[model samples]
Target: VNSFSGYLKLTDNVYIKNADIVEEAKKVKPTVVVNAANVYLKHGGGVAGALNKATNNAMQVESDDYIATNGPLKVGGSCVLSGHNLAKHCLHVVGPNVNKGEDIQLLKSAYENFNQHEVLLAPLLSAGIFGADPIHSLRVCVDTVRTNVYLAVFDKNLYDKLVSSFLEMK
Candidate 1:
C-alpha cells in the first residue's frame, strides 16, 4: 500500500505529488521523466543512477554521444533522451554543483528549463547525492516548472515529511 499520497497546486493545471517514484512512474507514465544528470551523463549514482537502472541502462548508452558533443552541460540546461519503461522521454538536467543547503536557486533554474509537458515526473532534484532536502526541490520544481509536475519520493518517511510541510504552508 502507498504510505502517503498527496498533491498541491502551483499554477492552473500544475500539480505536485509526494508518492513512490517507481509506483507513480508506472501509473502516470509521464511524458517526460527529468534526470539530474552530471556533465558526463555517467548515471553512476543518485537520481541519474536510479533512472539509468530503471531504463535498463539505456540512458547511459543513449546519453554518451550527447554528452560527448555537449560536455559539461550548463547549469539550468537540459537534454532529452528517448525513454523506456513508464516514460516516453527522459529529460537530463544539469544540476548545480552545490551542497545540501546551497542548491535552491540552481534547482529552480533547472526546473525553469525543464521544457513543457502535460504530465511530467521529477525527483527531489538535488535532494539525493547532490545534498539537498526534498522540500527545497519540491518548492523549486513547483515554482519553476509551472506545469503538471509530480515529485516522486521513494521513501515513505520523506513522503510524510513533505505532506506535513505542505500542510504547514497552508
Candidate 2:
C-alpha cells in the first residue's frame, strides 16, 4: 500500500513528503530516521510503531538494552540506534506533552539530535499523539534541522498544513 502522494522540495536539501515516514525512510535510505519517542522508548504506536515494524521490532529490543545500560531518556534527550532495515541509523527523540514553556522548549531541544545526520527521514514530532501544534512543531523542526531533511507524514490534513505552513513561514 503506497500511501505516498507526493513531496515538495522546500529547499535544496529539505523536503516535505505527503507520505508515510517509514515507507519514505526505507525508500530514501537517508543517513538516519528520527522517531518521536517517549523516555521509555516504547514502540507501541504512531511513528515509533511504524519504525519498529519496519525493523522487525529490533528497535525496541535495542532500546530496552540501551535503557538498561544508559538509563531512561529525558525529555529533549535522544539516543542513536542502528536503523536495522530502514536507514543507516536512527535517532529516538523524546518530545514533550503539554507544559507551556517546558513543552515547546523540550520539543525544540529534541531536534538538536538531528544535527549529526547528513540526510534525515524525520516524523512531525509531537504533532500527533503527543498533541503539539502541527504548524508550530514543523517550525521548530525546520528551524533546527534546516537542510537535508525529509519530514514525512500520513494524513492529508497534516500534509496540507505542512505544505501551506512551510511556504507561509517565508
Candidate 3:
C-alpha cells in the first residue's frame, strides 16, 4: 500500500481503510504512502493537522515494538475555496477570500509541513479552484512568504521562477 501509494500516481494505489495501516504494521512491511483529501482552513487545517498528530503519535505507538514501516506515503490537500471545500476538516487556510492572503499562507504551511524532520510527502497544488500556472504558482505563493527556498512545483521552470522570486525578495 505504501509503496504503490507513495511513488506512483493516485490511480495506481488502492484505497484501504484505517485498519490497513495497522495490519501492515503487524506484517512488518515497508511502505510509503500519499494521502490526499480535503484540507480546509476553517477547520484549522484539518487533514494535514490530523496527519501531523497521527505521525507524532505513531512514533510512540511503534516505540513499544511489533510495528515497523516507513510511511503511509505523502499526504496532501485537494480542496480549495467555495466554503464547502474548506469546511470538511481542521485545515489552516491562509487566505480568507480570493483577495486575501490565503494562498501565501497555504504555501507557508505546505513548505513548513513538508520540510519537517520527518519524511516529506508531496503537497497538492492547483487542486483548488483559484487558477495560477501550477509549475510556478506554488513558487509565487510560497515566495510571498519572502524566504530563500523553493517548493517542488509540478514543473521545474515554475520552481525556478519561485527561486527567482525568493532572490528578488532578498
Candidate 4:
C-alpha cells in the first residue's frame, strides 16, 4: 500500500507509491490522473502512452479535437479531457521543451495544478525522457504538491532509490 505513514512527508499529503498511475486511477476513479502531455496533446511514450492504451486511444482523438477547436495549450498550462474506461477525467499538463530548457517554474505549476484535484494521480514529471534526475523531480514535487496525491513510478528499484533520497531532504 502506498500509504503516507513510512514515506517522506514533505507536506501532510503527498505519497510516493510504487504503482502504475493508470492502474491506481482505475481503482479510485475519483482521482484525476495526470498526463505530462505536450502543448499539442499528442500521445507518445511514457505516461501519455500508457493513458492512450488505457482509454482505447480515444484520449488522443479527444485531445486533437480540443486542440483544433480551441488551440494548442500553452506550455506550463493545462486543460481537461473527458475520461473513459475506469477513469473520470484526465488532466493534461504541458511544460517546455525539455531539450531546450527544463523550465522549473513550468514544472512547478504542472505539479501544483496536479494537486488541484482532491485525489491526484501524478507521475514523477521528469524521471523519464524529460531527463530529470530522480532527486530533481522529487524536490520539484515537494516544492509543489500539498494535497491527497499519489506519485506513481512503476519501478521497484527507482522506488527504493527515491525513498532513500527523500529521507535526506527537509
41-91: candidate 1 lDDT, tens digit per residue: 889986777778887877788888777776757766687778688578888
Compared to the true structure, candidate 1 yields what TM-score? 0.81
Q: Where's the lowest-lDDT run of ten residues in candidate 2?
A: 1-10
41-145 in candidate 4: lDDT tens per residue? 898888888988888889998999999999988777888787677467788887555666767667777677776677666778756777667677788777777
TM-score of each predicted structure versus truth: 0.81, 0.89, 0.28, 0.87
Alpha-carbon runs more than 4 Å astray in model 1: 1-18, 100-104
Model 3, runs deviating above 4 Å: 1-117, 124-150
lDDT tens digits, residue span 1-170, model 2: 12223668877766787788887876667777889888889889999998998888899899889989888998998888888888778889888866333467887788777777766788888777788888888888877874577778889888887788888889
**Candidate 3, 89-155: lDDT as tens digits:** 2122232122332453454444443332222223333333433344344443343323221122333
C-alpha positional error of residue 140 in candidate 1 after TM-score superposition, expressed in Å:
2.0
Q: Which candidate is the best by lDDT?
A: 2
Superior candidate under lDDT, 2 versus 4: 2
lDDT of 2 at 99: 38
Better of 1 and 2 by lDDT: 2
Local distance difference test values of all predictions, in order? 0.69, 0.80, 0.30, 0.75
State which candidate, 1 or 4, has the greater lDDT: 4
Model 1 lDDT on a 0 to 1 scale: 0.69
> In TM-score terms, which candidate is top?
2
